Structure 1
Amino acid sequence: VPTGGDDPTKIAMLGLTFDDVLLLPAASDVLPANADTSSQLTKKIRLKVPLVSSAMDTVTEARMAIAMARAGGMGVLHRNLPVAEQAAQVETVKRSGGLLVGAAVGVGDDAWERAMALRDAGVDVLVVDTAHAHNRKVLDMVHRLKTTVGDEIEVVGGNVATRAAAAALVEAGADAVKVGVGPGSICTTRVVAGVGAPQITAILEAVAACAPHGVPVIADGGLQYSGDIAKALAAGASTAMLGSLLAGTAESPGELILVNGKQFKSYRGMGSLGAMQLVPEGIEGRVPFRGPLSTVIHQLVGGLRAAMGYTGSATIEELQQAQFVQITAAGL
């Protein structure tokens, strides 16, 4: 084996990230303004805009969830707070009209009661929210939720970064599979544990397991530009989950911070010291202040629409069939 040892499977693939590829233009009759950006979040739920906000305490509470839903996407409420308060945030969202909302739950001992309280509050989507879903406890939670509340609530499981893990969630009854182990902007798992999977390859692999079963893939983490949304969807994802790109908005939790004459907001991993309060797998950082959510979503969707024009994609389902060119470090 060219890279060492005698086992060709030891280094099992070459992982590509968003920056490694560009979408190729193709024959097009599609004007950006007329593209249909709707897409499946889950088997049953279709969003007008294929974007959901991260389940993080510096990204999504009620205000963000309301704004995301009004913009045609959805928020996933974070779970770093008492069950009663999270359920109260769900009720706050539902009191602003017929707005979709999701909420994260873990697999710990309080997870089941949390899930039931969220169900009682009218949640539309439960996200079984872990760093590594290829685990019996996570698969069992997904299955139990689907068998118990599955007729009224869509159940998302994650996160995964391999075909086999995606396949396991599908078998457990997941209504969507969330992909991303290691790619988050505030993630240190790659350096702390040495574990991860570049996101374009992770999506291609997860999609290979999920698409044949009609299960949508949510691309979660590592998206830094509007163009990355188009790349994620072209790799076969049905929606993208955004943390960093939304953390600087007015609607995210937290105050405005002024450093060196510039405006920022705090953005921190849920595995950071501050969020857990230990072996942290996230950092506490800041992102530039970006103004209203509605405006940020406009620009993100605008970039997606441009990509749909260039690739001749009238719908997100067509964009999922677009082709890439791999680029070098020289090219950017």
Structure 2
Amino acid sequence: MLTIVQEALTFDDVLLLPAYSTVLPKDVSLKTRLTRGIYLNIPLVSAAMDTVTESRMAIAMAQNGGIGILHKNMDIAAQAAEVRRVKKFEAGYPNSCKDDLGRLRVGAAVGTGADTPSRVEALVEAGVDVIVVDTAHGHSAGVIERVRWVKQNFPQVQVIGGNIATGDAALALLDAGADAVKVGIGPGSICTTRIVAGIGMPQISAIDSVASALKDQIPLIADGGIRFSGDMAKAIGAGASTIMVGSLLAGTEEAPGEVEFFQGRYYKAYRGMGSLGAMALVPEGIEGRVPYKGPMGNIVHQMMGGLRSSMGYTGSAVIEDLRQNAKFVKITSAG
């Protein structure tokens, strides 16, 4: 007999309801926690992608109150040099996300392969704030044990495990010692996992499954499928503490890559980390072009401003009020 666990929901399936409010959007607090030890000034995290985050994006992310996760599609020395570049950065930004030493915060992605022990050690030595054990399947023994290894061998660094879509996976990573979990199997804009493997979990239900199991022991990063500022609000309302974006920050001035002149117009490359180009396993991501967006600051302010509006509508003065008091309605295909 067929095991249908639930009818799973995505961002477009739901709407947040307005509630009694004494807070104006301009006055809400966007401060949240990335991990149990790291706090951010905005709930935004830039994706660990070779077309989204390198030192330039990580600096801009940290200056705006968030954090950048440096991609792992570079050799250990190149990646350690990128961590140092952010940690040693000095400006000529009051909401800057900084460590105890007043340096800009940064994260770096690691895999589970042979190079991981050397990669983790080089990144910790360079002063990385958080190690992200970055995979397509966080509910594997390789990820769970690598998370345990990072925590036991480098307790001075925060560790994130992903990607997950269920509460069982969250509990496994919590028991291993993760300081946060990254949620998202199938919601990515460049994701073909659903087509290739027939695997996935609609993001609102993934956030819910994970947040319900964790019971706020560790925060969760809602990773993938964010298209509008409304999706960020819905993700936080569903239980997320932070939001990871790829697409929205791709195309910006601070993102890696040069601007290309295609059909008169200006673009930047955007590709999945499991795409043919990025891998050089069957590909699980697509390669494409995104329009040139200019400085990332504008996109970030547009997105945060929409989140402030939502918190104004829901009567959420702080991120934690949205996370605890959000009420939703399920909408149909017509809505």
TM-score by length of structure 2 reads 0.94
Aligned equivalent of 1:92, options 75, 85, 91? 85
The answer for the alignment partner of 2:21 in structure 1 is: 28
Give the Cα–Cα distance (whole angstroms) in 1 for the partners of residues 82 and 311 of structure 2: 35
1:229 aligns with 2:232: yes
Per the TM alignment, residue 262 of structure 1 is displaced from its structure 2 partner at its CA by 2.4
Look up the equivalent residue of 1:126 and give its one-letter code.
Answer: I
Per the TM alignment, residue 259 of structure 1 is displaced from its structure 2 partner at its CA by 2.3
The answer for the alignment partner of 1:242 in structure 2 is: 245
The answer for the alignment partner of 1:63 in structure 2 is: 56
Aligned equivalent of 1:79, options 69, 72, 81? 72
Look up the equivalent residue of 1:37 and give its one-letter code.
Answer: L
The answer for the alignment partner of 1:291 in structure 2 is: 294
Per the TM alignment, residue 278 of structure 1 is displaced from its structure 2 partner at its CA by 4.6
Number of residue-to-residue matches in the alignment:
322
91-100 or 231-240, larger mean C-alpha shift: 91-100
The answer for the alignment partner of 1:42 in structure 2 is: 35
Secondary structure class of the residue paired with 1:203:
helix
Secondary structure class of the residue paired with 1:182:
coil
Secondary structure class of the residue paired with 1:266:
strand
Aligned equivalent of 1:175, options 157, 174, 179? 179
1:215 aligns with 2:218: yes
Per the TM alignment, residue 325 of structure 1 is displaced from its structure 2 partner at its CA by 1.0
Q: CA RMSD, aligned part only?
A: 0.9
Aligned equivalent of 1:52, options 45, 61, 71? 45
1:105 aligns with 2:105: no
1:325 aligns with 2:325: no
Give the Cα–Cα distance (whole angstroms) in 2 for the partners of residues 91 and 147 of structure 1: 24
Q: Note the alpha carbon deviations across 1:135-193, whole angstroms, 9 max, x for none.
A: 1111111011111212x211000010011111111111110000001110001000001
The answer for the alignment partner of 1:262 in structure 2 is: 265
Show structure 2 runs of 5+ residues with no match. Answer: 91-102
Show structure 1 runs of 5+ residues with no match. Answer: 1-5
Aligned equivalent of 2:140, options 115, 135, 141? 135
Aligned equivalent of 1:199, options 198, 203, 220? 203
Look up the equivalent residue of 1:314 and give its one-letter code.
Answer: A
Give the Cα–Cα distance (whole angstroms) in 1 for the partners of residues 309 and 70 of structure 2: 30
After superposing on structure 2, the runs of 4+ consecutive aligned residues of structure 1 that deviate more than 3 Å are none
Q: Percent identity?
A: 60
Per the TM alignment, residue 267 of structure 1 is displaced from its structure 2 partner at its CA by 0.2
Per the TM alignment, residue 113 of structure 1 is displaced from its structure 2 partner at its CA by 0.7
Q: Note the alpha carbon deviations across 1:53-73, whole angstroms, 9 max, x for none.
A: 000000000000000000000
283-292 or 72-81, larger mean C-alpha shift: 283-292
